[PDB]
Structure formats: structure tokens, C-alpha cells
Amino acid sequence: ASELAARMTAMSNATDNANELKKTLSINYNRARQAKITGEILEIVAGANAC
Amino acid sequence: KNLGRIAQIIGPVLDVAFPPGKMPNIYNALIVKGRDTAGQPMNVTCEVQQLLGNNRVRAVAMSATDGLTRGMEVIDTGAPLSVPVGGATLGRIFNVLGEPVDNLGPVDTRTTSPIHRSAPAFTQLDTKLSIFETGIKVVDLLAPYRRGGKIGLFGGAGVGKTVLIMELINNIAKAHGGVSVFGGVGERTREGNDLYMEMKESGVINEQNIAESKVALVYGQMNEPPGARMRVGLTALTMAEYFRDVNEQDVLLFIDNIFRFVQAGSEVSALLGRMPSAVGYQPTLSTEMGSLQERITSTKEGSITSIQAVYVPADDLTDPAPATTFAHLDATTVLSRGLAAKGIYPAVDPLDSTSTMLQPRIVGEEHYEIAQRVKETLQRYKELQDIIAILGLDELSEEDRLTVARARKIERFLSQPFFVAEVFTGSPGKYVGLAETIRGFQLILSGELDSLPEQAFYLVGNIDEATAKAMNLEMESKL
Amino acid sequence: GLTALTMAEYFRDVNEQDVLLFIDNIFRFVQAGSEVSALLGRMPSAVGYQPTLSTEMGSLQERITSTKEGSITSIQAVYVPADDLTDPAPATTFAHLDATTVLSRGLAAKGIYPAVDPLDSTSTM
Amino acid sequence: LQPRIVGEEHYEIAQRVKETLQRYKELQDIIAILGLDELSEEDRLTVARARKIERFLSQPFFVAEVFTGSPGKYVGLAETIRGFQLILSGELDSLPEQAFYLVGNIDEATAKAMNLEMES
Amino acid sequence: IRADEISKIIRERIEGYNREVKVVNTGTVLQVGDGIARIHGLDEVMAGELVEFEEGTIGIALNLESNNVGVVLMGDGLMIQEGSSVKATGRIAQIPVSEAYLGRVINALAKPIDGRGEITASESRLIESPAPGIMSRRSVYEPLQTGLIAIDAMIPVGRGQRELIIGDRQTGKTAVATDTILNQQGQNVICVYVAIGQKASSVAQVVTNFQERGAMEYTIVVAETADSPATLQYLAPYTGAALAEYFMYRERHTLIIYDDLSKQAQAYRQMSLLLRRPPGREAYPGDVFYLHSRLLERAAKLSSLLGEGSMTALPIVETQAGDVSAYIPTNVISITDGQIFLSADLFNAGIRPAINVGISVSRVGSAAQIKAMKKVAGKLKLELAQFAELEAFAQFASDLDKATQNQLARGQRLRELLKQPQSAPLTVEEQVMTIYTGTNGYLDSLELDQVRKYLVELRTYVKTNKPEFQEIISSTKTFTEEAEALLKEAIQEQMERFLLQ
Amino acid sequence: MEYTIVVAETADSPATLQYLAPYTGAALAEYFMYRERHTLIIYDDLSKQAQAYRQMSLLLRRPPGREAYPGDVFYLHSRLLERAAKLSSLLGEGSMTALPIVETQAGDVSAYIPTNVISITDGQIFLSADLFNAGIRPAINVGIS
Ligand SMILES: Nc1ncnc2c1ncn2[C@@H]1O[C@H](COP(=O)(O)OP(=O)(O)OP(=O)(O)O)[C@@H](O)[C@H]1O
């Protein structure tokens, strides 16, 4: 029973650490995707400005 | 009148050649006398977007351009787009041009108003932040609206978003002296027809007595060019704005939905060839959103409350369109598929939905504390959702057993029998003021009605009808 | 590419025999089109390829086909820039290629050769 | 940072600090989700040493004395190399982490440790 | 250094400047290359009007500029010379359309490429007509049986609904499309299949397949191969829509397959960049949403007076690396009603058709379902929701309570239910059979693999030995207690004989 | 309001006016600052001014960068801010305190305009969405402020 309570505490902490990790990673991903799309559009319009 | 010829056309962007003296202003609507394949005159409309000089403007079409010819006659109307307004438009479908498409009859109203206008002055606003009372228990207690403020609508299909809209119209019509308007910015035509028929059946549009209806529907479909789908919102706005500036009626302005207006403006700027901003929106995203989100206020005369749907693309709350929209929004009500699938209608989640209006110094300390205790009980229920199943509901402590019991009572009392969903269900519609609401939750949560069955609070109006139904259920259970 | 294709097309047309047409590398054809596009006067499309990309790949692939007379079997290799199958030219060749095999840097780096990524590789046969 | 310039002792201790900090940087992804409990004996050893190391790298400055309140310490190479030699040898393994935080010399670190054991 | 100023036109104007006279009778070719041609004159030509180059090369006057008409070439020009005289035509992109198109293969000019013979037609329909209006439609009523248990239960498609098929490379989009088309032999619909930028060999495979199946008796297969011009690849789906709406307006039901719209959008962006139009995302023009909206919304369920005709658009878009929030995916997802989302990780895992049941949606919904289908589909959807929640508990099937163990068991068998062989479409009654056998709980006994063989044997045994069931459902379209008892009887009979094997 | 002057340009005002308004506030403040009077100016926000400047810069076909912000987007803020000083004792000691406001999406301090403003101002008072939504108002995060 002590070992299973220990594993339950380990999971109750590790799943929430994985929660905060997925949240901060999704935020970094949103910023990165926004920057990528902006860079691609700006490099497209740079060629149009060249012509 | 002022006559000019078409210089060049590139899709819905036309150029018009006026003589040196006469030349329209910015945003001046332009009728273009044009033909059809049957030879029939078809008047295609525009709006001057740029005075590009050399006595030649660059106007953006509001209709189909195929068939228009270089050198056709364009007449300068000399003023921004003037739509038909007033009580004539009630129960009538419209376009971006204010020209109706229900084939009922012509709008014989003489009153027009320009689609373009400045926001109400700073010496005009009604500074009192008041909670716009709706009659729905969930959105009254947990997501209280403000009058003259903007309210975002977050609901994926099947949660009763349209039934919620029709109920909101019905309540603003019956309780108050209000009138609603619906602006379908980019509305797929099949669902536009669906909504029109559901309003015909739900009595929101009295098909037998037009102008006794409660709504003036403005449908600008996805079929229409990108120039039209943007100005649809301004059309609906000015048609609503008449209803409160002159008649001082509490108007509801539904915009479904804001993101598609934002991307329609993005398409217009793209066609116009102005350099893009960040991830792909138009450079004037903030100013364009302002031009539509600052006519929605509560002036000294009336109040426009904007209940607009919002859509988040790529799940971003930080994409420019959601970010700018949220910068304007005042309260968000979020509808969840969980409550729809279960049967607690409306399907509003009292935790995902929040308001900035639920401050104590706005709503009263009693309302605030009851809302806080309700939120705490429902949150503790979500936290115990997994615990109770494994532990058994009896092995819980007395405090947590009380919590789950009262949480079930509260979650079931959040259900309401709708005025417009009675045609489907069979339960009569009900209206619940905040007095009934706060006292009902005080009784349920204060441990006083903790001796009633779960079902006695389900789809009930107020706590008095809850007690009545409880006595019925107990007599029905004895024998 | 079009030179070798016209030679093989003669071989299949009049000498009416099966042909093997190995191409390597086929991405460099679209590469050259992209290099020459902007200087010719065309506006740059997405990430840098020519606007005439789909029809360029058409003018190669649809010319390369098996007929009643002869059958051109063509085992051609598509370079993928930075292993991104989202890149337009690898994305475009996929529509014309019947049997496709995708090499994965994981399988190549681990030491499993040939490095054909099996679950991503699909055939129509 | 080449021995021909800086001396073999300086170079070697720099390589060992870089090694241990690299290993902790690797184990960061694991420990974020799991915790230090799930690591091996040598892994947990390296992680504890890396904590002590990355805190001993810290030094209070004379110009930051207005924000920290603590008098900045000046500590050159003769004490830098020696202190790091000791930390990576593990003689000071009995000391906590906060003894190496915001000190100039390893002696000041040890004195702060003696204070952290005076405050029972 | 200006276009339209060729130092020969200035000569002609210096000769004839006296006053600016109409010159629409004539038109000359100034600049020509990569599929477009800038044209002088033609001052009264419309937008979209066919302009006919000398030597026979049709073009379309897309963007009329200041003094030059930018024209897309409806072929490979490469022979029109500078200064050659173009004549206008007056027509705006029409196709002749008749019932004799049923059963043939055509290019985007509605001109046959099967080599059989010419298609006699009388009435012409414009290619870019306007859609049915806000007051010329009817709310979706009638179920279009696609033949897939999963779709016909969980993502119900209707007649007049624009249900999008979206996926990655090789997830089975064309597979589900042909599956539906081959299901609709029985009921009376016209199928349309518009291929944009695909291999002539792939069009040959699908056409030969419909031939050996018999579904060529009601289909028109528009084909536009990759080498074809961007304008023809762009104009293909609109020719498909014109053909389809001709049959629609004559009270008949249609189904059209845009396979795909991604290549149509790519041809459009190619042309728009080629005749110098401002780019947007991925160098698409602003008008790609306008394009897709017009084309899609041309297809809907007409009202009662106009004949109750309808036209289901079943478009396809292919998504790259699961970027379903890209430009053309978000466009088509916004315009369409439903989305049938296909996933390659299920496709590899064996679950074919590889639809993604948690992502897929249809805002028509159970309205377009048979009553028997909805009676079984409610229970089916609840069971699948439950197993979808319990998916992260299958490894722990050794120490879960037996109730969630049995929910895992039921969802495990239900996954075995929904798989189907390639292009083998089922009828609504057989699908009701399958979903009933599943949802009631009659497959817990048989192990995880036999379920498919058991169910096919079940359907055949019912078909042979209780022919009242299919008749009951064909007559009433309602799952009635009599057919329920009959199906229970047939099920246990087949189970016994199969177990004695 | 006996002390206060409110220079207001709301959302649906020309981006040029939203770009001008902080400088009107700055001139007003400086007038009193130079004649031996202390001032306190509250810009709200600088990121909205940065967006207005981006709009009126991309409307001029100006080469942008770093999330489409123009080249002079640091020059904008530094010009506006660096005229806030505690004056010398010769010029009358009148000082203009400036407390600009900046909004962050998803707490993106590492964004272009937040890091630019941070590299100008003499500190930061970072408010926290989780702290403010947990009831600890005001939500000053003294860990990083
Ligand atoms: N439901 C299914 N059951 C078994 N096999 C299938 C199924 N669907 C597709 N397949 C197999 O997958 C292969 C790819 O199918 P299909 O060509 O329809 O995918 P696609 O999406 O059209 O590919 P692309 O996107 O490249 O056009 C086919 O060869 C077919 O044999």
C-alpha cells in the first residue's frame, strides 16, 4: 500500500508537470508558427516589391 | 449628377474615370450601370477606397464583376452607402446594400442612413456600467452581461447556439422594449435559410404580420465578393443604431461571426495591394475593428449590446484577429458539447465562461459571493469527478458528500426551459430575474433545500417552481 | 530531363519496346525553373518556386507515360530539401508517382540500410 | 581556453565543469517531468554536483550592491580554480546548495555553510 | 520602360490620333509568354469573355487593364505572334449540356476524350452562373447513403450538403469518393467526378473501374491532367458544376466530386501571379475564398416549387503534414458544412476507412438519417465516445474494474466493426444490421479478429434466410420491434452455426 | 482631475493620431517639467502606438521586419521615453515620471515590443494573469519586477 501510494503521488505530480510542459510548449509553438508564417509572407512580398 | 467611365477592372477592384472637377470622396458608393447576358441592366455597386489621382478613383465592387466592360457609365451617388432603416426592416432579410432578398416586398421606408459614421462622441456615452439582465439563470449568475458592451460567443455546433440566440431575442423583446438584429457576415446560404425558417417557426418572425417581428436579418453570404462581406457588419450596425438613437430601444446586435469579417477585410486589403501586417491580416486590423466596435455603446439615448460569435484559428488566442477581438470584448459565454450531450440546456459551461462584469463593486457583494460559492462547488465537483468513481460516493467525507450533492443540485438547476425550444421539447418557456436567481442559489447552496431530489431542479424556472415540482415528484413517488 | 525523355519516348514510340528511365535528380529540374523564374519576369510564389511549377511538373510527368505501343518504366528520385515533404516540389511529384518510397534520416542514421521508411512509403499495387 | 595559454590545471577543471554542466543539461528533460528521484546513482551524483556548480558560478558584484545589499566579492583565478577543483572532487558534498550561492571564495561558501548549520 | 507602349502602337496613334475612336473590332497581341498574353484594343470586351486568337487559340479576358487586356490562354500558345489580330467572341465560357453526357469522359471544355463519339446537346448552361438564393432552397432532408458504416452513422451526409473530405497523402480520399459513387447505383442520382491535375493513368484506372462495376451508366467524369493549362485546371470544377446543376434543375439528384480543390487553387494562384496580381498567404490571391465560396455554394437542395432538385458537393482537399489550419484547408473548412477527416496513423494501424471520428463533424447531422439509422446511431456514438475516453486505459486492462474493462471490450469490437474492404459499399439495411449486432452486445464472445468474418457471414445468412428484414426497412425506413425480434433471431442462428463451424 | 490632463485617442481614430497622442502628452508634461514642476505621465499603451505605427508604415510600403514592425519602432519608443528625466538642479529640478503600459499575449515578454520597451525603461512591473485570476490583486510579480 505504501508503494502504491508513492506511485500515485509520483503520477499526481508528473502528469501536472507534463501539463505545464505541454502548455508552455504550445505557447512557444504558437509564437514560432506565427513568426514562420509572417516570414514566409514577407519574403513573398519582397519578391513582388523587386518586380 | 456626376458621370464617369470605368478605367480598368481587376476582379472586384474597379477604376472609374471622372472629369477633372467632379470626383467622389472616400467611401462614396458608386452605382455602375451595367448589363446582363440577357441585355438586362444590372446595377453593380462599389465604394471609393482610394483617390489614386489623375482624376481616377479605385473602388471596390460589392457584387459580381464578370461582364463589366471598360468604359461603362458609373454614376456618383455622392455619399456613403445609405441603407433602409426603421421598423420597416423588421422581419425582412437584407444584403450589404440594404436591398432585400426574401422576395416579400420592397422596403417602402424613405429613411436611409449612411453605412459610414463616426462613433458616438465622448460627451454622449452613458457612463453607468449596468448588468444587462437576460432571464437565463446561467448567463445571469455566472456570465453576467453588461449593457452596451460586447459579448463573445464560443460554441461549437450542436450546443444550441442558435436556440440561445432566438431565446435572447425573445427575452429582449418580451421583458424589455427591445428589438434584435442579426448580421450574418459570411453566412453559408443553407444555414441562412435554416435560420430564417427556424425564426418563422419560432415566432421570432411573424410571417403573417411583418413589421411586428422582433428581428431585421442582414445576410451577407460567403457567395458575395470580399468587399461586400466586410461592409455587411456596418450595414447591420447602422440598422441597429437607428433603433436606439431615435427610438431609444435596447437593441441586440448579433454578428456571426467576427473572424470572417476580419478575414474579409484582409481579403479586401489583399486585392487593394497594400503591404500585409503580421501573420497575414490587413495592416489596419486594429482601426478596422475599432470602426465597427466603437459604434456599439450605450449613449444617452439607447444601448447597442453586441452578442457576436468569435472563432479562434489555429487554436490561437494570440492570433491578431482573436487578440484584437478580445481587446474589445467584455464578457465571454462558452458553450460545451458535454452539457449538450448530457442534457443540461443551455450548454453553457459556468467555468469556461467568465465576465469582467462579475466584480463586487458592480454586481453587489451578495451576488458576488453566491457566484463565487457556486463556482467553487462546481470546480470541486470537477476535481472529485475521478475520485468519487473509484472511492465510492459513501467513502467520501461528509463535507465532500455535501459538496457533490449540492453540486449536482446546482448543475441541474442551471437548466432552463426555453421560450423558443418549447416547440421541440414541450416544456413552457420561463423567465428568471436575478432576484429569483440569487435567492434560488442561496437556498440550494445554503443547505436549506438540501432535502430535494436531483430531478426536482431540472429544467425549472425558479426555486418556487422547483419546490412545486419537488412536491409533485414526492407525491408521485409515494404512490 | 526533357532531352532524355524525348530519346526514351522515341524508343517507346517506334522501337515499341519496354524502356527503363532512371532519373536523378528530378528535383533539380524544378530547381532550375525556380532559379530562372524570377529573372525572367515572374513574381515569386510561395517559398520561392516559380508560379509555373504545377504545369512544369505536368509537362514532364504527363509526357512520361506508358502507352499501347511501348511502356516506359521510370524509376526517378526526388530530392526533398531538409527532409520536409511539405516542400512544394516533393509535394507535387507525389501526385504523379504511382509507387512512392520515402527515405528517413532516422533509419539511415541508425544504420538500417536501405532506409525506406515503411509506414510512410506506399504503393498503388 | 586552451592549455598552451591558460595552464593544464585551468584547462582540465574547465573541461570537467563543462562536462558536468552538459550532463545536467541533458538530464533536464527527464527531471522536468519525473524529478531527481528516478535517476541512477551516478546521474543523481552529477545532478547534485551540477546544482552546486551552477550556484558556485554566481558571485555578488560591487556595482550590484545596491540591488542585492550584499558586498561584492573579488575572486581571481588562484581561488577560482581551487574552489572548482574542490566542488568537482566532492569533498564539499556534505554542504548544501545555498552555501555556494552569492559568494566569492570557496572559504566564504564554507563559512556560510557553517552559519547554515549554526542556525540548526 | 512601359508595357503597352511598343513603339508601333505609338506610330499607329500618331497616324490616327485625330480623336479617340472605338477600336473594339480589332485587337493585337503585344506580349505573350508562359500561358498569358497582353492584348491591345478590345475596349468593349467584358470580363471573362472568350477572346479568340488568330490560329485558333481561345483565351479569356480576365483582368482588363488601362490600355491592355491581360488574357489567360486556354491552351499552350507558343505560336501566336506579336501583333497578330485577336477577335472577340461575345460568349462567356459556356458548355453544351445534355443527358447524353451520362456515361462519358470529357475535358474541361465539355468535349469528349474517351474517343467514343460526339455528345449531342441542345441546351447550354453558363459555367459561372449564380448560386441558388436565400429563398430558393430547402432545409436538407434526404439521406445520401455513402456505403460506409462510419460515415452513414456518425457523419451523416445529406442531399444538398457540402461535406468536405480532407486528409493527407494516401489516406483514402478518392477511396471514399469511389465508395460512395459505387454505392449510389441503386437509388437515382447522377454522379460527377471532376479530376484536377491528376494523372491520366489514375483517371484511366477510376474510369475502367466504374466501367467494370456498372456505375458508368450515370456518371460524367471530367478530367484535367497535369500538363493541361492552369486555366483548364481552374475551369474544370465549374464545368462539373454546370453539368451537375443542369441535372439538378430538372428535379433529379446529383453528386459531384471535386478531386481535388487544392490543385484548382494552385492553378488559380499560378495564373494570378503570372498576370501580376497581388499575392496573399502562400502567394494565393485574395479571391481564392471568393472562388471556393461561389463554386461550393452553387450546390444545394432546391425548394419544393423549383423541383426539389439537389446537388451534394463532396469536395476533397489534401492536407500537408497535418497542417489543417493552413490557408486552403481553413478556407474549405469554413465554407463547407461538414468535414470527414482522414488520418494516416489510423490508416497504417489497419482501421480502414481511416476517418477520424473525434474530429469529423457534419452540421446537417441526424436530420439526414434514416430513422432506423438514427435509432442505432445514437447508441453507437455513445459507445464510441466512451471507448474514446477509455483509450488511455487499455494497457491497464488487468486492474481496471470489470465495467470499464467491458467498455474497453465493446469499443474494441466496435473498432473491428467499422473497418471495410476497399470499394465494397454496403446498403443502409446491412449497415443497420451491423450496427445493431454491435450495439446490442452480440460480439463480446468472438475474439478480436474473427469479428469481421463473423459479421460478413451474418449479413449473408440474414440475406438468404430472413428476407423480411430488408423488405421491412425498405418499405418503412424505420427500425420496428418486429424487425428487431427478427434480427435477434437471425443473429443467434448465425452465431450458433458459425460457432459449430 | 484638478491635476490631470487626459489626452485621449480611442481605437477607431486614425493610426496617425494614435501615433501622435503620446507626443502631445510628452509636450504637455515637458512644459510643466521645465518650469520647476513635477509631472507624472501614464502612456496606455505603447504597444497600441506600435501597432498604429506599423499600420501607417505598411500603408507607405516601408520595409518591415521582426513581426512586420518598421525599422524605427525602437526609435519611436526611445524618442518618446527618453525625454522623461529628473532634471538637474540648474534647470529647476522639475522631473517628468513616465509609467508606460505594455500588453503581452500569452505572457510573451520575449516579444519584440515588450523587449524593446524593457530595454528603454528603468524597470518593469510585471502583472500576472494567474495571480490576478486567483484573487491576489494587484498582481505585481515581485519575483521579476
Ligand atoms: N478503406 C480501405 N480499405 C482498404 N484499403 C484502402 C482503403 N482506402 C484506401 N485503401 C488503399 O489505400 C491506397 C490509397 O488510396 P487512395 O488512392 O484512395 O488514397 P488518396 O487519398 O486518393 O491518395 P492521394 O491523396 O495520393 O490521391 C489504395 O491503393 C487503396 O488500396
Ligand SMILES: Nc1ncnc2c1ncn2[C@@H]1O[C@H](COP(=O)(O)OP(=O)(O)O)[C@@H](O)[C@H]1O
Ligand atoms: N435550449 C435548448 N433547449 C432544448 N433543446 C435544444 C436547445 N438548444 C439546442 N437544442 C437541441 O439542439 C438542436 C438545435 O441546435 P442548434 O441551435 O441548431 O445548434 P447548431 O446550429 O450549432 O447545430 C435542436 O434539435 C434541439 O433539440
